[PDB]
Amino acid sequence: NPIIFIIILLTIMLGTIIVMISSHWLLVWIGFEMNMLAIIPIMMKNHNPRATEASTKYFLTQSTASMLLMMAVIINLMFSGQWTVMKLFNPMASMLMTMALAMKLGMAPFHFWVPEVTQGIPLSSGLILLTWQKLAPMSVLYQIFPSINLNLILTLSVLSILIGGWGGLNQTQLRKIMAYSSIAHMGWMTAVLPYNPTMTLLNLIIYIIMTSTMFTMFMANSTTTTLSLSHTWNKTPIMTVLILATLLSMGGLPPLSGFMPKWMIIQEMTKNNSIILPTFMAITALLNLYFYMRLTYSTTLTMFPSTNNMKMKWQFPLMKKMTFLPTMVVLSTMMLPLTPMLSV
Amino acid sequence: QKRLGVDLDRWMTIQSAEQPHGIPSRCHAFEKEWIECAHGIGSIRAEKECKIEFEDFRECLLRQKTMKRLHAIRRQREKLIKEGKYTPP
Amino acid sequence: NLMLALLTNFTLATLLVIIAFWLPQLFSMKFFLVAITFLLFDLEIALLLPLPWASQTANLNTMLTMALFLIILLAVSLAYEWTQKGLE
Amino acid sequence: SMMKWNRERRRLQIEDFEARIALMPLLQAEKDRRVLQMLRENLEEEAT
Amino acid sequence: MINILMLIIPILLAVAFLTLVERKVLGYMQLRKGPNVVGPYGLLQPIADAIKLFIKEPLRPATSSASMFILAPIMALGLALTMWIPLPMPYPLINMNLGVLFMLAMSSLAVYSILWSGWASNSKYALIGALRAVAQTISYEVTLAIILLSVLLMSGSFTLSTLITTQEQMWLILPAWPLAMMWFISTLAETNRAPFDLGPFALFFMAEYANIIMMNIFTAILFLGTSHNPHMPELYTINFTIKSLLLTMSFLWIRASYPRFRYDQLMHLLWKNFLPLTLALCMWHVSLPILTSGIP
Amino acid sequence: AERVAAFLKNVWAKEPVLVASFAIAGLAVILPTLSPYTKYSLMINXXXXXXXXXXXXXXXXXXXXXXXXXXXXXXXXXXX
Amino acid sequence: MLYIVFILSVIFVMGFVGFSSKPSPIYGGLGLIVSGGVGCGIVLNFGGSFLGLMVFLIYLGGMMVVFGYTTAMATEQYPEIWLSNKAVLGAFVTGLLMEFFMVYYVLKDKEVEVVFEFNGLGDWVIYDTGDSGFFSEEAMGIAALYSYGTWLVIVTGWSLLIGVVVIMEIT
Amino acid sequence: ELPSLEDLKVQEVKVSSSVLKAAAHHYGAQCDKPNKEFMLCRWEEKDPRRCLEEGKLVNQCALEFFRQIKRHCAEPFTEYWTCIDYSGLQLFRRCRKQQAQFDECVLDKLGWVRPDLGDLSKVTKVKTDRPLPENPYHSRARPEPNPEVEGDLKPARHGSRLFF
Amino acid sequence: SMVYMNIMMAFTVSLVGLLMYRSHLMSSLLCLEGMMLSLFVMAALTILNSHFTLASMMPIILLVFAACEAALGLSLLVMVSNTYGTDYVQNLNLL
């Protein structure tokens, strides 16, 4: 595909800009549906039966998500009648606002599409456009941080790490593990929103970079654990060392800068007399680490995936941000712990 | 807003703003109180200082307080059936 | 009344159907693209509807730059359609 | 030929809107009625 | 309210007497003669066709799918007669807030009449043949919307009564000179047989012939009019009947003279030939009331 | 000429309706900026009062008088 | 007789009963003709003739017409009768009993609801407006404008450029 | 709420027809001051409860204008009025010939005055009645906002985080 | 209050109608049209009663984006009928 693929990709970039730079309620409504028209062609790409099934499952869940969001916009005319994105002014519209944004994100009750959508994506270039897409509903949630009830956000954040922590244990597909770490990390996202809206934006920065480092290192084609197994000996051994720095960082480990969200999310919550919730956060986070525990053994060990066919010609992929971003993803906890102020 | 629109105008969002020609809002006078009450951050986080001016503004759009009142008159008008009822028009 | 004008037309239309029945005694996916183009052009026409309706009061220097712009992209969409459209 | 007729319509339309501006007892008829209707409503409230 | 009944029964007579004029004008265009054995000059045949087709002629059901086949004539005959309501014949029957919006909508809702009849038959060859006929009706309504929006942009609002006032001395044929040619072709959309051709058979084309008169009168207001004269409504109506019927003969002219376009090439007439021309005129008609002052 | 004379007469021979699609739409953009006649249309458009007039309380003010015919205010008299 | 909007609103929900029920896409397609056409009348009663006729031009003059094509493309020929279908009639009978049983409580004006809002009279306060304006008024006399909302014109144009390009790449 | 009394509305009103008033826009030129006094009252004070005595002067002056037409040139005025009702909704077209018969009769009197431009917002300097600032709707002044911190910020602690 | 007790009820009925299935995938997209139709009426009543004048353009824009989804999602439905015989919810491959 020539220029038209870049134009479609630029309209997702432009689509989230309408969401970011906004004041009107129908303006963000357009911004969400600008993405809906633009992700689907990249979802298809290679003319697959899996791609047709994934896109239809992606659309029918996210089209209903937007129409539930528009109901919250119309109730904002029923009561008050002000079309400025600041507060919902309703105990009813706030319910239909948070649950609609939960549909677009990987939050607890509306998570079922996430693993099956990720499987149907043809290439690693399309796999980024779900992790980057989650910036759009998060940007609205930052704007309407008050007037939203704790009983139907924090319950959806706690359950998502529970179902995320058990949702990747019986899975071997590399796309499916990344799809359930998405559900796992979204619980750490929305838990901060009541206890200071700050650090939610920084949690995005850590997550989006760390997820993009994975798929750019998955440019050497691998879909399963057994296909990423034949990489230690048949392919380059230095590549297994750099993926190890990204696998272990996604779980809660302090020498790596993937502990930098788990630094402040617990810290800000403990300030507001809540200890029983951050305990439940950190223990369930070990189940998220446990996926990468068995996935590190694919790279650290021999595991016998030799294969008679040996590659002599050197691999030439895109690798656009595959060098600059993992250096920041591995070490930033010693570099910038004062970056909380710089981001938000 | 996550990112502000500086040196550019794309608002026209709030009620009782710049009219298309000169056409007024149905609740124009009530927001002349509401916007003037809550232009600062004092009654934005607490929302207690402008409670008097919000209840009358909520009454403008819904008309629920008049709806309960007019129903009470209509029920008592129906109570006058086979009693001391009079109709001037 | 508008309802009085509508119902009288429909009731006499159904009355002719009563005369018509009671009185006697004895695949191809290419055509889908047409419907796609039609529906997408309707909305651009729907946005170009208030032209002899809003131009009476509003400023002309602001409108003309935007009014032509909708018809331009309505032709730019057709410019993309020209490069391999179909046999139909 | 069309634009010369449109400018003739401009002379008519300004005269049409002038009749709207000139009439203010038309606006007075509204506010006189609103007081009289409310007084009948108040008498209905006193009776019921 | 007797006026509605005075716009159904004499209107259905005009549809009935159309079959004679379609046979007589096309007849004289083909050197043959019209009906003569029936009456004095064959004038007793439209009532003779009504007794033949309705009373004794039965219907052998192909499948009869419960709700449909009986629902499709309601969408055909009913929607064709509702189009007569907002027409600015001196003083119209309950004048609409917006005239042409009701005119364009009920014509675009008339597409269902051929759609539901496609569902009425169980056979696949009927519905594929039906959708091909829908494809012609669906496409030319885009041009029907564009040409209307460029004619009104010259003068008048959506009200049909204001379209009479603009044609006080000059017709809208001359300022909209390429659009006058364009609108005449785009009116051949509702299975007019001149560009391309696909309950009982009788009442189904009674709605289709009614739409031909409907477009003939719609051309006689948007492009014709001459004057209004509020003092005498008679002088307008006599003059209107001549203007409308001269355009009615022209629809019997294109059908007589010209063969079928080939369905594909008829779809190549639109998008490739018509739509680049109409949108360029639509661009041109935006600039005209701004270039020279004329925004009523 | 390399394409001015070459790629114009070919367009007249091969699909001349495409000439009309660029020329008439082209004149629709260029001519409104060039013509010194667009200024008159904006003047009457603002002059036409759809809403009711409002009276302002004057305390030492110029270019304002009574509702009767007097040399005051805007009141456009462009070509009668 | 006295009510105008409330009688039409019942027929509006009655159309949606055929959407909660699944009586095959053909009979469900007839729902958008019934509920859509009546849906115009609900908009038209409060005013704004332009906005009421938008459903006639787009939903009834495009949307369901294109949806008429796809019913012929997939799941075509014959629609199965809803009387013979199991649970489809069960969803239909439970759907109407959520509305028709409620109307009996709306009688005598006020009614109890799941939400805090009551029914009311809906006859004198049905219009909710006095005189308001005069010439080119009724809120939707000058409804849509290219002026002031210049930004919204561009973004709508962007999405309609996307639509033509994207569907071509899908098929 | 406290509305006006039952005997507050002025007697002798709405005697003229809807189009009979629309036939003569000379009412905009002669008897214009009392109309402008009521107009200025409404924009200053939005309530009809206060500006009703000014409206009594409007209804009184309106009858004074129409009685002059009742006394003199009744024949060309009624002929113009029958012409204005005979037409549909044009209201000014197809009646210009009988508009020539009008004004010509009125030219003998001082009543004839026709503007060929419009009103274009006329100012009333003679108006006093009541002062404009008197709080039209406002009851509370609204509590004072957060005080703006004046002065340049200085680094003192240098990061109040866990380290450095 | 009066009308809003029906059009909100019609929205909740269509909300059930989307998520309930009898194997037909065409009926879900048909209900998505109804969902936007119910959102159209609910927005129209709020803007027309409280004379906004500016907000009247917003449901017209909403009508455009109603048809944006209810065509591009409809085009994907055709692609299911290209790969498989007839469109069914039961006919799936993803795990």
From Swiss-Prot, chain A:
Its EC number is 7.1.1.2. It is found in: Mitochondrion inner membrane. Core subunit of respiratory chain NADH dehydrogenase (Complex I) which is composed of 45 different subunits. Interacts with TMEM242. GO terms for cellular component: mitochondrial inner membrane; respiratory chain complex I. It is a multi-pass membrane protein. This is NADH-ubiquinone oxidoreductase chain 2. One of its GO terms (molecular function) is NADH dehydrogenase (ubiquinone) activity. Belongs to the complex I subunit 2 family. PANTHER family: NADH-UBIQUINONE OXIDOREDUCTASE CHAIN 2 (PTHR46552:SF1). It comes from Bos taurus. It holds the Pfam family NADH_dehy_S2_C. Signal peptide: none annotated. Keywords: Electron transport, Formylation, Membrane, Mitochondrion, Mitochondrion inner membrane, NAD, Respiratory chain, Translocase, Transmembrane, Transmembrane helix, Transport, Ubiquinone. It catalyses: a ubiquinone + NADH + 5 H(+)(in) = a ubiquinol + NAD(+) + 4 H(+)(out). The lineage of its organism: Eukaryota, Metazoa, Chordata, Craniata, Vertebrata. Core subunit of the mitochondrial membrane respiratory chain NADH dehydrogenase (Complex I) which catalyzes electron transfer from NADH through the respiratory chain, using ubiquinone as an electron acceptor. Essential for the catalytic activity and assembly of complex I.
Swiss-Prot record, chain C:
The keyword Membrane applies. Keywords: Electron transport, Formylation, Membrane, Mitochondrion, Mitochondrion inner membrane, NAD, Respiratory chain, Translocase, Transmembrane, Transmembrane helix, Transport, Ubiquinone. Core subunit of the mitochondrial membrane respiratory chain NADH dehydrogenase (Complex I) which catalyzes electron transfer from NADH through the respiratory chain, using ubiquinone as an electron acceptor. Essential for the catalytic activity of complex I. Core subunit of respiratory chain NADH dehydrogenase (Complex I) which is composed of 45 different subunits. Interacts with TMEM186. Interacts with TMEM242. GO terms for cellular component: mitochondrial inner membrane; respiratory chain complex I. The keyword Transcription does not apply. GO terms for biological process: mitochondrial electron transport, NADH to ubiquinone. Its EC number is 7.1.1.2. It is found in: Mitochondrion inner membrane. PANTHER family: NADH-UBIQUINONE OXIDOREDUCTASE CHAIN 3. GO terms for molecular function: NADH dehydrogenase (ubiquinone) activity. The chain crosses the membrane at residues 2-22, 31-51, 60-80. Pfam families: Oxidored_q4. Belongs to the complex I subunit 3 family. This is NADH-ubiquinone oxidoreductase chain 3. InterPro entries: NADH_UbQ/plastoQ_OxRdtase_su3, NDAH_ubi_oxred_su3_sf. It is a multi-pass membrane protein.
Swiss-Prot record, chain H:
Keywords: Disulfide bond, Electron transport, Membrane, Mitochondrion, Mitochondrion inner membrane, Repeat, Respiratory chain, Transport. InterPro entries: CHCH, NDUFA8. GO terms for biological process: mitochondrial electron transport, NADH to ubiquinone. Residues 28-69, 70-113 form the CHCH domain. It is a peripheral membrane protein. Residues 141-154 have a biased composition (Basic and acidic residues). The keyword Ubl conjugation does not apply. Complex I is composed of 45 different subunits. Contains four C-X9-C motifs that are predicted to form a helix-coil-helix structure, permitting the formation of intramolecular disulfide bonds. Accessory subunit of the mitochondrial membrane respiratory chain NADH dehydrogenase (Complex I), that is believed not to be involved in catalysis. Complex I functions in the transfer of electrons from NADH to the respiratory chain. The immediate electron acceptor for the enzyme is believed to be ubiquinone. Belongs to the complex I NDUFA8 subunit family. This is NADH dehydrogenase [ubiquinone] 1 alpha subcomplex subunit 8. It comes from Bos taurus. The lineage of its organism: Eukaryota, Metazoa, Chordata, Craniata, Vertebrata.
Curated annotation (Swiss-Prot), chain I:
It is a multi-pass membrane protein. Its main location: mitochondrion. Keywords: Electron transport, Formylation, Membrane, Mitochondrion, Mitochondrion inner membrane, NAD, Respiratory chain, Translocase, Transmembrane, Transmembrane helix, Transport, Ubiquinone. One of its GO terms (cellular component) is respiratory chain complex I. The chain crosses the membrane at residues 1-20, 28-48, 60-80. It is found in: Mitochondrion inner membrane. It catalyses: a ubiquinone + NADH + 5 H(+)(in) = a ubiquinol + NAD(+) + 4 H(+)(out). One of its GO terms (molecular function) is NADH dehydrogenase (ubiquinone) activity. InterPro entries: NADH_UbQ_OxRdtase_chain4L/K, NUOK/Mnh_C1-like. Its EC number is 7.1.1.2. It is an enzyme of class 7 (translocase). It comes from the Eukaryota. GO terms for biological process: ATP synthesis coupled electron transport. Core subunit of respiratory chain NADH dehydrogenase (Complex I) which is composed of 45 different subunits. Belongs to the complex I subunit 4L family. PANTHER family: NADH-UBIQUINONE OXIDOREDUCTASE CHAIN 4L, NADH-UBIQUINONE OXIDOREDUCTASE SUBUNIT ND4L. Core subunit of the mitochondrial membrane respiratory chain NADH dehydrogenase (Complex I) which catalyzes electron transfer from NADH through the respiratory chain, using ubiquinone as an electron acceptor. Part of the enzyme membrane arm which is embedded in the lipid bilayer and involved in proton translocation. This is NADH-ubiquinone oxidoreductase chain 4L. It comes from Bos taurus. The gene is MT-ND4L.
